[PDB]
Amino acid sequence: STGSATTTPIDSLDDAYITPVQIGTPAQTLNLDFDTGSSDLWVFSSETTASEVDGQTIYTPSKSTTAKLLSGATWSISYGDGSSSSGDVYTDTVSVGGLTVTGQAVESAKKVSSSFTEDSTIDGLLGLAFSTLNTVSPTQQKTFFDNAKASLDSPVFTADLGYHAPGTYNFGFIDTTAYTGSITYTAVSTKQGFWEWTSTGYAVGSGTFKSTSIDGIADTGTTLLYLPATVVSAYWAQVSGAKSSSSVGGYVFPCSATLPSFTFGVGSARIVIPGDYIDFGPISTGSSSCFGGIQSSAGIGINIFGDVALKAAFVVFNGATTPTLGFASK
Numbered sequence: 001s002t003g004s005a006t007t008t009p010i011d012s013l014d015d016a017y018i019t020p021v022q023i024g025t026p027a028q029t030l031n032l033d034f035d036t037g038s039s040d041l042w043v044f045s046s047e048t049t050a051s052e053v054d055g056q057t058i059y060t061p062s063k064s065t066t067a068k069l070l071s072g073a074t075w076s077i078s079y080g081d082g083s084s085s086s087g088d089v090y091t092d093t094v095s096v097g098g099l100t101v102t103g104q105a106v107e108s109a110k111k112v113s114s115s116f117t118e119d120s121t122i123d124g125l126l127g128l129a130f131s132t133l134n135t136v137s138p139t140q141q142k143t144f145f146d147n148a149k150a151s152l153d154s155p156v157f158t159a160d161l162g163y164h165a166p167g168t169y170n171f172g173f174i175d176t177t178a179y180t181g182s183i184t185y186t187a188v189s190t191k192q193g194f195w196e197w198t199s200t201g202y203a204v205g206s207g208t209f210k211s212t213s214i215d216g217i218a219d220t221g222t223t224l225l226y227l228p229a230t231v232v233s234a235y236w237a238q239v240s241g242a243k244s245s246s247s248v249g250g251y252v253f254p255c256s257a258t259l260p261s262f263t264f265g266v267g268s269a270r271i272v273i274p275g276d277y278i279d280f281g282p283i284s285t286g287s288s289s290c291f292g293g294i295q296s297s298a299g300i301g302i303n304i305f306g307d308v309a310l311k312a313a314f315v316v317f318n319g320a321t322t323p324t325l326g327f328a329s330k
Contacts, residue, residue, distance in 0.1 A: 002170070003095075008166045014162075015223050021096055026064075036159070036317065039135075045109055046062065049110065107141075133194075163274075178314050181328060185316070204262060206260075218305050240254070252290060254290070262275075
């Protein structure tokens, strides 16, 4: 089997992407944030504290003839940005782009943090990291991909995120029309539960490529590109007037600037992030100080190839017995 679904930016900055997901019988369609940095499929629901729901579409398990309470199961998750959610668990039928999993764990939120309430466009998350990170207790549950894998034509999914435009998540096949050149595959460590890999270096604008190993994670659920302080300083030094602002929480730059591109290495291959992908707009409405899309990972504890990086590529998440990651230009 295969599936294919369009993923759409939630706003004009590509802060996140939402993908429609059918849950239950009859289907209830929710728009979920597909997150290769976590492993829980959780949703706003009829069980979510009413004051914490503000415009989201909810899953109502009592209206699904295929929903079953997973007795005794609870979940609770905290994300790198400080947000969190928790609740109980149902199993139900879940379909993405025509690909159906029966008995998928659907984690129903009883509580969500303010950041989730305040974002009316995201109805929940669909985790695509390794199932070892799933938070369900006392019996850990499998991701949608893990459940689908054996049935897929090939045990893969691909992320093709757009810049200021829709893109695609495919399951079970590689669309050879969706990228240019070849896909370069690179080794993955699953030791921390992430799609963790090592970039071979970087360049800033038309500058020389610096060969250096950068361990990090491919994370569709993180907006920005978080890299070591040395690398980030080298980038922003090429932007007149750019500075790190402790008050704002990262590098800012004059909105009048033209940003240089940023290149990262995948083996001997190179992915070029155009300068415009690195602009996250005014820090507050009407400001002429703009927020940068490349930020330091210092104190995160891990480098993160978030949407800024991934949207410059066609990315293969290969879930074969030994997983790997592939990147192509597009």
